[PDB]
A paper describes a structure:
We report an in silico strategy for the biocatalytic synthesis of chiral N- and O-heterocycles via Baldwin cyclization modes of hydroxy- and amino-substituted epoxides and oxetanes using the limonene epoxide hydrolase from Rhodococcus erythropolis. We turned to cofactor-independent limonene epoxide hydrolases (LEHs) that normally catalyze direct hydrolysis of epoxides by positioning and activating water at the active site. On the basis of the well-documented mechanism of ReLEH, a water molecular is positioned by H-bonds to N55 and Y53 while D132 abstracts a proton from the water, enabling a smooth nucleophilic attack on one of the substrate’s epoxide carbon center. We have rationally engineered the epoxide hydrolase ReLEH with construction of a general platform for Baldwin cyclization reactivity of hydroxy- and amino-epoxides and oxetanes.
After screening 576 transformants with automated gas chromatography (GC) for 95% library coverage, a distinctly improved mutant SZ616 (Y53F/N55A/I116V) was obtained, enabling a 2:3 ratio of 6.7 favoring the Baldwin reaction mode, although conversion to the anti-Baldwin product 3 was only 13%, the rest of complete conversion being. We were pleased to discover that when using triple mutant SZ616 (Y53F/N55A/I116V), the tetrahydrofuran product 10 was obtained in 96% conversion with a 72:28 enantioselectivity ratio (e.r.). In order to gain insights on the active substrate-LEH interactions, the X-ray structures of the key variants SZ612 and SZ616 were analyzed. Consequently, the representative substrates in complex with LEH mutants, including the models SZ612‒(R)-1 and SZ616‒(R)-1, were constructed by molecular docking. Following the docking analysis, the epoxy ring O-atom of the substrate consistently establishes a hydrogen-bond interaction with the protonated catalytically active D101; the aforementioned hydrogen-bond network with water molecular is terminated by substitutions Y53F and N55A, enabling the substrate distal hydroxyl moiety to form a hydrogen-bond interaction with the deprotonated D132. In contrast, the model SZ616‒(R)-1 unveiled two peaks in terms of the dihedral angle θ, revealing that the attack from Si- or Re-face has no preference in the case of SZ616. Moreover, for both of the SZ612 and SZ616 mutants, the slightly shorter distance d1 was observed during the simulations, indicating that the ON atom preferentially attacks C1. Furthermore, to better illustrate the bond forming and breaking in the Baldwin/anti-Baldwin selection pathways, the hybrid QM/MM scheme was employed, enabling the calculation the activation energy barriers. It is of interest to note that the shorter distance d2 allows a relatively low activation energy, and hence the formation of Baldwin product is favored for the two variants.
Residue numbers in the entry:
A (entry chain A): 4 to 148
B (entry chain B): 5 to 148
Write the structure that this text describes.
Amino acid sequence: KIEQPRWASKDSAAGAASTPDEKIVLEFMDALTSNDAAKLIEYFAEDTMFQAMPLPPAYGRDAVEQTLAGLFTVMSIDAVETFHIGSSNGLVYTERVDVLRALPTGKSYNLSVLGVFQLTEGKITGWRDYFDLREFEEAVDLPLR
Amino acid sequence: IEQPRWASKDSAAGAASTPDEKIVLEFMDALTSNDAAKLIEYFAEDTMFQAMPLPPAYGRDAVEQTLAGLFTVMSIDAVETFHIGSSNGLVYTERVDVLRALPTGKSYNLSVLGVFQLTEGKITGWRDYFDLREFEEAVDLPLR
């Protein structure tokens, strides 16, 4: 389904977790397809934040969970393909496609996402996904902003 | 530029710790030249650029035309890289690009997460992820 971008690194290491933190992030990417904020929130420290960057940030584990829960009321993460994962300084970066499916319309969209995760002691203390919201909105006829 | 509330206070977070990251950080600063002919020197011949909301440019020439194209309507006034990291020949920059739309004189602080692939110190891929509409609406400039 998810084609390898032409620009994807052909260094096969780039797409695999090479550290405990990158491993957690890829496990978390897999967990995203649960569409289950209660499951996902277990990856997060209390002192954390989440931001789909087109949308407002959620600060604190509670806000993260409820903000995630809110997203999963309207969209399913059907698949997450991480082409590149890297990390430095406690930040993990993921270049991904998230196959998103708007529940109201049933339309799916391959969201090109570059995500950054701050981990502290194996828990997510920051997760920001960068992507273009409009193209997603217009594709799936789902008003998010 | 205000450091986001989530910006690593770890000072090594925003600092290049590898030759690639150094090149990228230097490239970020070189973006404020708004000079596609200067910028393209950072790029390998086999390269690509994509502001991810917009079509990619493949090939050094296509990247230069695209950057030159972007600079006719947009000034990169500042690039603040909060976070830079790298693995496996990829450099990641979490940044704010202070963008100023030339036709409107309006500026916007664009939250960008960018990825750079470098081969032998040359950029073989540069993809910036951000939300275009927020930028378009902030600067009254429909780039799409």
